[PDB]
Write a protein that holds these residues in place. Structure first.
Motif, PDB file in Angstrom:
ATOM      1  N   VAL A 129       0.728  -1.342   0.134  1.00 37.53           N
ATOM      2  CA  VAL A 129       0.010  -0.037   0.003  1.00 37.53           C
ATOM      3  C   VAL A 129       0.992   1.148  -0.014  1.00 37.53           C
ATOM      4  O   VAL A 129       1.809   1.231   0.814  1.00 37.53           O
ATOM      5  CB  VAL A 129      -1.023  -0.216   1.296  1.00 37.53           C
ATOM      6  CG1 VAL A 129      -1.815   1.414   1.221  1.00 37.53           C
ATOM      7  CG2 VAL A 129      -1.987  -1.191   1.103  1.00 37.53           C
ATOM      8  N   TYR A 130       0.715   2.042  -0.977  1.00 36.06           N
ATOM      9  CA  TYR A 130       1.497   3.451  -1.166  1.00 36.06           C
ATOM     10  C   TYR A 130       0.525   4.574  -0.652  1.00 36.06           C
ATOM     11  O   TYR A 130      -0.728   4.404  -0.787  1.00 36.06           O
ATOM     12  CB  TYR A 130       1.689   3.644  -2.574  1.00 36.06           C
ATOM     13  CG  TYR A 130       2.562   2.555  -3.115  1.00 36.06           C
ATOM     14  CD1 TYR A 130       1.917   1.396  -3.649  1.00 36.06           C
ATOM     15  CD2 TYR A 130       3.968   2.733  -3.089  1.00 36.06           C
ATOM     16  CE1 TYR A 130       2.742   0.330  -4.101  1.00 36.06           C
ATOM     17  CE2 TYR A 130       4.692   1.644  -3.780  1.00 36.06           C
ATOM     18  CZ  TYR A 130       4.258   0.465  -4.346  1.00 36.06           C
ATOM     19  OH  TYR A 130       4.855  -0.332  -4.784  1.00 36.06           O
ATOM     20  N   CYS A 131       0.860   5.477   0.173  1.00 31.54           N
ATOM     21  CA  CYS A 131       0.180   6.616   0.618  1.00 31.54           C
ATOM     22  C   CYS A 131       1.188   7.605   0.958  1.00 31.54           C
ATOM     23  O   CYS A 131       2.555   7.450   1.301  1.00 31.54           O
ATOM     24  CB  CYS A 131      -0.690   6.160   1.975  1.00 31.54           C
ATOM     25  SG  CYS A 131       0.307   5.746   3.485  1.00 31.54           S
ATOM     26  N   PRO A 132       0.630   9.124   1.226  1.00 28.88           N
ATOM     27  CA  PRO A 132       1.570  10.119   1.502  1.00 28.88           C
ATOM     28  C   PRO A 132       2.176   9.928   2.773  1.00 28.88           C
ATOM     29  O   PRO A 132       1.222   9.475   3.946  1.00 28.88           O
ATOM     30  CB  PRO A 132       0.912  11.378   1.618  1.00 28.88           C
ATOM     31  CG  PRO A 132      -0.433  10.938   0.661  1.00 28.88           C
ATOM     32  CD  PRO A 132      -0.715   9.371   0.906  1.00 28.88           C
ATOM     33  N   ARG A 145      -3.818  -6.665   6.971  1.00 22.91           N
ATOM     34  CA  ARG A 145      -2.590  -6.669   8.137  1.00 22.91           C
ATOM     35  C   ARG A 145      -1.404  -6.033   7.647  1.00 22.91           C
ATOM     36  O   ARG A 145      -0.813  -6.229   6.734  1.00 22.91           O
ATOM     37  CB  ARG A 145      -2.616  -7.965   8.872  1.00 22.91           C
ATOM     38  CG  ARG A 145      -1.770  -8.066   9.895  1.00 22.91           C
ATOM     39  CD  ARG A 145      -1.667  -9.809  10.164  1.00 22.91           C
ATOM     40  NE  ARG A 145      -2.834 -10.372  10.270  1.00 22.91           N
ATOM     41  CZ  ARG A 145      -3.539 -10.589  11.778  1.00 22.91           C
ATOM     42  NH1 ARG A 145      -2.846  -9.988  12.685  1.00 22.91           N
ATOM     43  NH2 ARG A 145      -4.606 -11.117  11.885  1.00 22.91           N
ATOM     44  N   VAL A 146      -0.789  -5.085   8.311  1.00 20.15           N
ATOM     45  CA  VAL A 146       0.303  -4.516   7.860  1.00 20.15           C
ATOM     46  C   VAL A 146       1.484  -5.194   8.695  1.00 20.15           C
ATOM     47  O   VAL A 146       1.557  -5.377   9.858  1.00 20.15           O
ATOM     48  CB  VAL A 146       0.318  -3.044   8.382  1.00 20.15           C
ATOM     49  CG1 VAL A 146       1.875  -2.367   7.876  1.00 20.15           C
ATOM     50  CG2 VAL A 146      -0.740  -2.255   7.724  1.00 20.15           C
ATOM     51  N   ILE A 147       2.478  -5.821   7.770  1.00 22.57           N
ATOM     52  CA  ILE A 147       3.528  -6.662   8.244  1.00 22.57           C
ATOM     53  C   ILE A 147       4.945  -5.938   8.052  1.00 22.57           C
ATOM     54  O   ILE A 147       5.950  -6.607   8.323  1.00 22.57           O
ATOM     55  CB  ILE A 147       3.317  -8.020   7.681  1.00 22.57           C
ATOM     56  CG1 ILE A 147       3.481  -8.013   6.270  1.00 22.57           C
ATOM     57  CG2 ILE A 147       2.199  -8.710   7.938  1.00 22.57           C
ATOM     58  CD1 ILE A 147       3.511  -9.388   5.292  1.00 22.57           C
ATOM     59  N   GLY A 148       4.909  -4.854   7.582  1.00 20.68           N
ATOM     60  CA  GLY A 148       6.176  -3.900   7.448  1.00 20.68           C
ATOM     61  C   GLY A 148       6.120  -2.666   6.690  1.00 20.68           C
ATOM     62  O   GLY A 148       4.824  -2.492   6.301  1.00 20.68           O
ATOM     63  N   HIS A 149       6.833  -1.741   6.980  1.00 15.86           N
ATOM     64  CA  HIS A 149       6.403  -0.350   6.488  1.00 15.86           C
ATOM     65  C   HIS A 149       7.868   0.276   6.390  1.00 15.86           C
ATOM     66  O   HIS A 149       8.875   0.128   7.017  1.00 15.86           O
ATOM     67  CB  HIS A 149       5.682   0.514   7.583  1.00 15.86           C
ATOM     68  CG  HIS A 149       6.192   0.725   8.934  1.00 15.86           C
ATOM     69  ND1 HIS A 149       6.278  -0.174  10.024  1.00 15.86           N
ATOM     70  CD2 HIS A 149       6.895   1.656   9.322  1.00 15.86           C
ATOM     71  CE1 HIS A 149       7.190   0.133  11.087  1.00 15.86           C
ATOM     72  NE2 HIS A 149       7.256   1.554  10.643  1.00 15.86           N
ATOM     73  N   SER A 150       8.027   1.194   5.389  1.00 18.62           N
ATOM     74  CA  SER A 150       9.258   1.841   5.204  1.00 18.62           C
ATOM     75  C   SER A 150       9.044   3.063   4.372  1.00 18.62           C
ATOM     76  O   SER A 150       7.924   3.190   3.594  1.00 18.62           O
ATOM     77  CB  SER A 150      10.112   0.891   4.112  1.00 18.62           C
ATOM     78  OG  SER A 150       9.619   0.759   2.972  1.00 18.62           O
ATOM     79  N   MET A 151       9.895   4.122   4.583  1.00 18.31           N
ATOM     80  CA  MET A 151       9.525   5.381   3.929  1.00 18.31           C
ATOM     81  C   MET A 151      10.618   5.418   2.895  1.00 18.31           C
ATOM     82  O   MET A 151      11.717   5.372   2.982  1.00 18.31           O
ATOM     83  CB  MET A 151      10.056   6.515   5.150  1.00 18.31           C
ATOM     84  CG  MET A 151       9.631   7.814   4.355  1.00 18.31           C
ATOM     85  SD  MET A 151       9.677   9.053   5.837  1.00 18.31           S
ATOM     86  CE  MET A 151      11.230   9.187   6.528  1.00 18.31           C
ATOM     87  N   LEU A 204       4.973   6.457   2.274  1.00 18.85           N
ATOM     88  CA  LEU A 204       5.037   5.467   2.874  1.00 18.85           C
ATOM     89  C   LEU A 204       4.724   3.979   1.857  1.00 18.85           C
ATOM     90  O   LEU A 204       3.552   4.365   1.321  1.00 18.85           O
ATOM     91  CB  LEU A 204       4.041   5.375   4.213  1.00 18.85           C
ATOM     92  CG  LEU A 204       4.501   6.270   5.290  1.00 18.85           C
ATOM     93  CD1 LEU A 204       3.491   6.098   6.452  1.00 18.85           C
ATOM     94  CD2 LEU A 204       5.957   5.410   5.956  1.00 18.85           C
ATOM     95  N   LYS A 205       5.724   3.164   2.131  1.00 17.58           N
ATOM     96  CA  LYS A 205       5.197   1.601   1.585  1.00 17.58           C
ATOM     97  C   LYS A 205       4.869   0.983   2.709  1.00 17.58           C
ATOM     98  O   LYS A 205       5.641   0.539   3.361  1.00 17.58           O
ATOM     99  CB  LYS A 205       6.190   1.197   0.766  1.00 17.58           C
ATOM    100  CG  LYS A 205       6.835   2.223  -0.415  1.00 17.58           C
ATOM    101  CD  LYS A 205       7.411   1.285  -1.601  1.00 17.58           C
ATOM    102  CE  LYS A 205       8.529   0.602  -1.402  1.00 17.58           C
ATOM    103  NZ  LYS A 205       9.683   1.635  -1.043  1.00 17.58           N
ATOM    104  N   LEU A 206       3.535   0.543   2.812  1.00 19.13           N
ATOM    105  CA  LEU A 206       3.124  -0.381   3.854  1.00 19.13           C
ATOM    106  C   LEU A 206       2.951  -1.845   3.406  1.00 19.13           C
ATOM    107  O   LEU A 206       2.135  -2.062   2.286  1.00 19.13           O
ATOM    108  CB  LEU A 206       1.702  -0.016   4.202  1.00 19.13           C
ATOM    109  CG  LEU A 206       1.676   1.404   4.931  1.00 19.13           C
ATOM    110  CD1 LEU A 206       0.050   1.586   5.212  1.00 19.13           C
ATOM    111  CD2 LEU A 206       2.551   1.632   6.076  1.00 19.13           C
TER     112      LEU A 206
END
Lengths: 306, 306
Positions: free
Chosen positions: B36-39, B76-82, B87-89
């Motif tokens: 998932v991509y978001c600001p 379910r979010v299992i990782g996130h990075s900027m 943000l890439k979730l």
């Protein structure tokens, strides 16, 4: 902020477009439940269109003369009937992508989105208004017949238009989904003249309210007027007369902006008499009449759909 | 015939929009494959936005602080990075409705469709151009952040824009899908001035060709010009200079209409100097610059997509 000529999202309608072929004519159809709707002139050749006798042409067709194609999915036609100017083809498969839907016959001045299609495939989407002379100013090429116009209410698609014809003047005519033409037009290739294309006054007023909401206020003047005095001026400029019903519909925009409907009318009156003098309103140098009061509220409030 | 500001059909993108919540901020995300991509300013409060330190704000967030909702489907979010400003979730479920897609960074003057969304739900679709000062003139309300701009090539969606900000002037700024802003803007609530909004000359010329194809020929004059003489005039009117690359791109429209690019330039030159004198072109009283040469060809040829 900002204001755009916005169309409805088209995904619910995309899943309903099919290609219909009869003989050598191919156009678009609308597949809902186990019925395909399409313009009845799918049974015509280009020569037939000069003077078609649809009942006599239809006698020579059987179910198996209609080829209905959805992507590569091939639908079997098991019944056909002519209802006014549309053909209803019963197929053996219900569309799994059928949305909640309704058929509505709209009034002049109302707006809708058109999904322009060719060979059953979507090409683009745009917003337009039914003109007071029952034409629409579309963008349609050969093969676009059967493309549909629609609105959305939360999760329900209201189908209001099916494209049938381009008049020799370059404007477009078609039917509701029960096959009845809007206006006096017929599905025959012959000279048919439209009446005067008047400006939709209540829509212009709605758009002026949108301008005020978005910070374009230069045209607000110091005058007021009456309904009779405004209508005297409007009719001279080929504007539709304003009624009390129209004043009522604009009430919520007058309340939000604090500008009385009749005060906005006096501002419009001076714009018609003096012009815009090289200025613009919401990025336009003409008075725009393809936003209804509901469109303005919807866009300025952020309404969403299923 | 006819010519409309047409958007791409939005169905392929509709199936990718989700709602992203972090704390009390909710905006839109784009769900492709299992990302998932978001600001990135979803992690900010309204107070943070005046001077955000994104790395420091991000330290205080875990996977379970991001709520991703697709309709009622809960991811379910299992990782996130900027990555730059996005943000890439990473989620546990790949989007079953993922289209063939690509990420592209567009150039000023190019056009695309925007699907305006609120709370992960589509509100409308419209066509716009990236201005030469790297803003877009959109229609966006609070909550619209994360709405995306896109083009379609047959069956492939090219994502080119994600909405991030409204400038104090009322124009809109955002990033490509790798998180890099178009232009010099930053995701901070502070005064940022855009440069001059010049007119996209090659697009105006394309639209004049569209007018000729559709029967609006009154502006065709008896003169010709040179590239240097035209550009001398254009730059005085805040028009972008025309290059040989632009002449090449217009070749197919010159061939179809029989009007040389430099002859069309001389027609435009007289329109800039004398104005349109109360006449219209394709129903507009201003010179329109939101159609690229490719848009004109596409609309006048009936190109379709998957």
């Amino acid at each position: 902020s900002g204001f755009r000529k916005m169309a409805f999202p088209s995904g619910k309608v995309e899943g309903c477009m099919v290609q219909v072929t009869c003989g050598t004519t191919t156009l678009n159809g609308l597949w809902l439940d186990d019925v395909v709707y399409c313009p009845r002139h799918v049974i015509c050749t280009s020569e037939d269109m000069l003077n078609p006798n649809y009942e006599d042409l239809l006698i020579r067709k059987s179910n198996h003369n209609f080829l209905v194609q959805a992507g590569n999915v091939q639908l079997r036609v098991i019944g056909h009937s002519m209802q006014n100017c549309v053909l209803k083809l019963k197929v053996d498969t219900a569309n799994p992508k059928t949305p909640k839907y309704k058929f509505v016959r709209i009034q002049p001045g109302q707006t809708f989105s058109v999904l322009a299609c060719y060979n059953g495939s979507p090409s683009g989407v745009y917003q337009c208004a039914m003109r007071p002379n029952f034409t629409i100013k579309g963008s349609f090429l050969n093969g676009s017949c059967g493309s549909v116009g629609f609105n959305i209410d939360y999760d329900c698609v209201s189908f209001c238009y099916m494209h049938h014809m381009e008049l020799p003047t370059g404007v477009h005519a078609g039917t509701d989904l029960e096959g009845n033409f809007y206006g006096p037009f017929v599905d025959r290739q012959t000279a048919q003249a439209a009446g005067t294309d008047t400006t939709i006054t209540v829509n212009v007023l709605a758009w002026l309210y949108a301008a005020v909401i978005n910070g374009d206020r230069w045209f607000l003047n110091r005058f007021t007027t009456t309904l009779n005095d405004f209508n005297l001026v409007a009719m001279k400029y080929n504007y539709e007369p304003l009624t009390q019903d129209h004043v009522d519909i604009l009430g919520p925009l007058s309340a939000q902006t604090g500008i009385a409907v009749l005060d906005m009318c006096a501002s419009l009156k001076e714009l018609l008499q003096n012009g815009m003098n090289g200025r613009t309103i919401l990025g336009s140098a003409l008075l725009e009449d393809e936003f209804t009061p509901f469109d303005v509220v919807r866009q300025c409030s952020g309404v969403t759909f299923q």
